[PDB]
Amino acid sequence: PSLWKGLVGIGLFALAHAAFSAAQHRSYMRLTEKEDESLPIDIVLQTLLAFAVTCYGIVHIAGEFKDMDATSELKNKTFDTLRNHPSFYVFNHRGRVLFRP
Amino acid sequence: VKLTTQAYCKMVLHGAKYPHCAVNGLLVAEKHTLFVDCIPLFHGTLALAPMLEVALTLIDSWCKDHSYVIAGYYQANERVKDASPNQVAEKVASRIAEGFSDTALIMVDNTPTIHVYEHHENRWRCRDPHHDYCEDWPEAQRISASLLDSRSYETLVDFDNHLDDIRNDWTNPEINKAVLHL
């Protein structure tokens, strides 16, 4: 589906929110001068989940691959679209006297 | 010597479906001669033997079961003014002459508008400069325009389009099926 863009959007939003939460916790820890200096696992889980979701989403929105075999792109071509040369077109055919003389 | 409204309508439809390219086919009839219908073969580059000699048998296999027999051959040149028969027209007319007498070599003059050359011991000489016989001209001219204005040639299919996809019917059922009710 085309909803992968919204998925990576929500992932990036959650990642930005986790970054803001980490900034707040760092400010608090530098205010109180605690020797633990351990990020809360609550925000660490959010960061990891957002990173995983966003990476899996951008893996999908990157675009699909194409076959390497050239004989696969011309399998639907027909000689009616290969004989025509846009450079050597001539306008003295019957379509001019038939369609709108 | 006369063509049926179905033969003429199929001819003009195939000629209008590919204006920039040439038009060729085989007028088949029942077994004095009346051209009931035509099977359009190819377009564009016609000076090629194998696909032309495949159509012979692939149409005979249908006509022998459908009680038909190939009577003539028509060609429409690329240019709008030149209507002289090429070597291909003669080389195909000579082939049908050995399997059915009274072969007519038809040249669709883009600018009536149809020439009929007959072979009498010396060459292929036309008859349109003197006179051309048909069953009824106004009926054909009306029913042809009735399918032309509706852009039915986009729906018409020939043998070349059938060689690309077999789901297409070279006998044109949906064309003569509309012709009967008009």
From Swiss-Prot, chain A:
UniProt entry tagged with the keyword DNA-binding: no
Secretion signal, residue range per the UniProt entry: none
GO CC aspect terms: early endosome; early endosome membrane; EMC complex; endoplasmic reticulum membrane; Golgi apparatus; Golgi membrane; membrane; plasma membrane
Bilayer topology term: Multi-pass membrane protein
Keyword Nucleotidyltransferase annotated: no
GO molecular function terms attached to this record: cobalt ion transmembrane transporter activity; ferrous iron transmembrane transporter activity; inorganic cation transmembrane transporter activity; magnesium ion transmembrane transporter activity
Biological process terms in GO annotation: copper ion transport; magnesium ion transport; protein insertion into ER membrane by stop-transfer membrane-anchor sequence; tail-anchored membrane protein insertion into ER membrane
Lumenal membrane side: 21-41
Localization, UniProt: Endoplasmic reticulum membrane; Golgi apparatus membrane; Early endosome membrane
Sorted UniProt keywords: Endoplasmic reticulum, Endosome, Golgi apparatus, Magnesium, Membrane, Phosphoprotein, Transmembrane, Transmembrane helix, Transport
Transmembrane segments annotated in the record for this chain: 2-20, 42-61
Main localisation: endoplasmic reticulum
Superkingdom of this protein's organism: Eukaryota
Subunit structure: Component of the ER membrane protein complex (EMC).
Similarity annotation: Belongs to the membrane magnesium transporter (TC 1.A.67) family.
Role: Part of the endoplasmic reticulum membrane protein complex (EMC) that enables the energy-independent insertion into endoplasmic reticulum membranes of newly synthesized membrane proteins. Preferentially accommodates proteins with transmembrane domains that are weakly hydrophobic or contain destabilizing features such as charged and aromatic residues. Involved in the cotranslational insertion of multi-pass membrane proteins in which stop-transfer membrane-anchor sequences become ER membrane spanning helices.
Name of this chain's protein: ER membrane protein complex subunit 5
Parent-record interval covered: 3 to 103 of 131
UniProtKB/Swiss-Prot annotation, chain B:
CDD domains (alphabetical): MPN_UPF0172
Any one Pfam family match given in the protein's UniProt record, by short name: UPF0172
Assigned GO CC terms: cytoplasm; EMC complex; endoplasmic reticulum; endoplasmic reticulum membrane; Golgi apparatus; membrane
Domain MPN residues, every copy: 1-123
Biological process terms in GO annotation: protein insertion into ER membrane by stop-transfer membrane-anchor sequence; tail-anchored membrane protein insertion into ER membrane
Main location: endoplasmic reticulum
InterPro entries xref list: EMC8/9, MPN
Membrane topology (UniProt): Peripheral membrane protein
Localisation: Endoplasmic reticulum membrane
Keywords tagged on the record: Endoplasmic reticulum, Membrane
Tissue specificity annotation: Expressed in liver, pancreas, heart, lung, kidney, brain, skeletal muscle, and placenta. Expression levels are highest in pancreas and moderate in heart, skeletal muscle, and placenta.
Record-stated family: Belongs to the EMC8/EMC9 family.
Protein purpose: Part of the endoplasmic reticulum membrane protein complex (EMC) that enables the energy-independent insertion into endoplasmic reticulum membranes of newly synthesized membrane proteins. Preferentially accommodates proteins with transmembrane domains that are weakly hydrophobic or contain destabilizing features such as charged and aromatic residues. Involved in the cotranslational insertion of multi-pass membrane proteins in which stop-transfer membrane-anchor sequences become ER membrane spanning helices.
PANTHER family cross-referenced by the UniProt entry: ER MEMBRANE PROTEIN COMPLEX (PTHR12941), ER MEMBRANE PROTEIN COMPLEX SUBUNIT 8 (PTHR12941:SF13)
Subunit field text: Component of the ER membrane protein complex (EMC). EMC8 and EMC9 are mutually exclusive subunits of the EMC complex.
Name this protein carries in UniProt: ER membrane protein complex subunit 8
Organism: Homo sapiens
